[PDB]
């Protein structure tokens, strides 16, 4: 039961389901202490059973319990765990992650197969902890906290921060992801090339694997952090290392529309 | 009484409790029929149940009565002014002891919490809870700056004497977690209250000199 930025209170449906069970339980105790007739006691016990049922699995038996003033059923314990919006599929089998970005993709014809074009402003946020360490290592900032204040305001960013960023990413790779990820080639590791602009440059030969075109598509960006994650991405997930199809064994990074036409 | 926060069966059971109370107090000598006297207790039990169980955040019965009266007054004024009354009109109609500020505070008191699972958008895949940040747990950035400051303060306290560092760490709660006092600090060391104050002040002056000559600790403030 949390207080929102505007001072209003937001609460979960479980509190309402718990209150109903507690209210009915307390009332039954009072009725039993009063020696109420069996008809009243039977109604209270039947309501107590239904209140427990709604708490555990709302709507499974009978009409769903709704919050007065609306017809939206209250979300019970079973609803929390089940379904496409439940705990399993929404929070355990997949998650939202840090060190991730997104932008529109354009074609980079000058790139090598293992390279991508990463915008500088995306890379600045994606590699921020590494950049702060490099800023402190150099004389750009006195400490990590001073360096972080420098990056907060756009007009406070100096031209040596971009030189430091170029050093941070040297040799590292990033993961480029396009939805839907139909097969494992929907994620590939590239060595970023910091570029001016706001769109990600994608190598032409990997568009078929991503099923990507340049009509407005977008991709996500992920930064593996440890040495193990960087080693796996550079060895196993690098685009230049996955040239054949895992499904049929035929080339999957190969000449395409304009390349075929010219040759 | 349906549609006021309690379900139909909940109203019946609360009413049944008033009916049980009515049988206890009903007096047949008066020659009044049972329903005339029982209807008072049945209604009273139902109404008290609504005042006590209709809201997630319970508002006392007296405050519930004030809220109901304020709603009635606004509704009557609204149908007479041909518009929504302002707090000044409502306060004037409520009577003595009421002003626009009190009318507004009472209305702020009577705001029910919103559900964290209310859908947003035509397709039900987004909810209010998905947009509310958690501001209790420290963030990774906040945790690191706290640990960085502790490391720097530890190094700065190294330049102090063996006992001067203990005095500052004891007085500022850097050891046991809670601040100690001059007398309590003296109890550990066996010195009088006045001397502890001076030695701590000299150490604090020492640290100030070190910080000025390094300026390695001002950024954390």
């Amino acid at each position: 039961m949390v207080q929102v930025d505007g001072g209003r209170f937001a609460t979960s449906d479980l509190n309402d389901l718990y209150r109903r069970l507690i209210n009915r339980n307390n009332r039954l105790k009072k009725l039993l202490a009063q020696g109420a007739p069996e008809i009243i006691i039977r109604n209270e016990k039947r309501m107590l059973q239904e209140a427990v049922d709604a708490l555990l699995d709302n709507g499974r038996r009978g009409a769903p319990v709704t919050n007065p003033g609306s017809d939206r059923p209250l979300r019970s314990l079973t609803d929390i765990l089940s379904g496409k919006q439940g705990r399993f599929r929404q929070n355990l089998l997949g998650k939202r992650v840090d060190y991730s970005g997104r932008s529109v993709i354009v074609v980079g014809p000058q790139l090598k197969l293992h390279q991508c074009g990463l915008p500088k402003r995306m890379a600045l946020e994606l590699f921020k902890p590494f950049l702060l360490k490099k800023m402190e290592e150099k004389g750009i900032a006195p400490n990590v906290k001073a360096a972080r204040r420098m990056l907060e305001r756009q007009r406070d960013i100096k031209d040596e921060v971009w030189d430091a960023l170029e050093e941070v990413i040297h040799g590292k790779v990033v993961l480029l992801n396009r939805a839907p990820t139909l097969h494992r080639l929907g994620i590939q590791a590239f060595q970023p090339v910091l570029v001016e602009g706001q769109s990600i440059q994608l190598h032409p030969l990997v568009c078929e694997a991503f099923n990507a075109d340049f009509d407005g598509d977008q991709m996500a960006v992920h930064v593996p952090l440890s040495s193990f994650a960087q080693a796996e991405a550079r060895i196993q997930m690098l685009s230049a290392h996955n040239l054949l199809s895992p499904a049929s064994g035929e080339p999957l990074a190969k000449p395409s529309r304009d390349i075929i036409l010219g040759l | 009484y349906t549609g006021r926060g309690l379900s139909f069966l909940d109203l019946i059971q609360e009413g049944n409790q008033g009916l049980i109370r009515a049988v206890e107090k009903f007096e047949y000598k008066r020659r009044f029929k049972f329903s005339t006297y029982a209807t008072w207790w049945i209604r009273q039990a139902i109404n008290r149940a609504i005042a006590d169980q209709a809201r997630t955040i319970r508002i006392p019965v007296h405050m519930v009565e004030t809220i109901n009266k304020l709603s009635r007054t606004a509704r009557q004024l609204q149908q007479e002014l041909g518009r929504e009354p302002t707090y000044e009109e409502i306060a004037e109609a409520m009577g003595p002891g009421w002003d626009a500020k009190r009318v507004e505070e009472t209305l702020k008191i009577a705001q029910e919490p919103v559900s964290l699972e209310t859908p947003i958008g035509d397709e039900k895949d987004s909810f209010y809870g998905d947009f509310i940040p958690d501001e209790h747990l420290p963030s990774p950035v906040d945790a690191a700056t706290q640990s960085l400051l502790s490391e720097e303060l530890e190094k700065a306290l190294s330049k102090l004497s063996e006992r001067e560092a203990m005095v500052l760490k004891l007085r500022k709660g850097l050891i046991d977690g809670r601040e100690h006092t001059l007398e309590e600090v003296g109890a550990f060391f066996g010195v009088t209250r006045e001397r502890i104050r001076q030695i701590e002040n000299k150490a604090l002056r020492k640290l100030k000199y070190h910080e000025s000559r390094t300026r390695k600790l001002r950024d954390f403030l």
Binding site: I39, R42, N43, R46, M47, E50, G62 | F8, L9, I12
Partner: peptide, 15 residues
């Protein structure tokens, strides 16, 4: 009605 708590209660009090 077995499915409807209200109908079941009304039937019982009508006895």
């Amino acid at each position: 009605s077995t499915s409807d708590p209200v109908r079941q209660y009304l039937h019982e009090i009508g006895q």
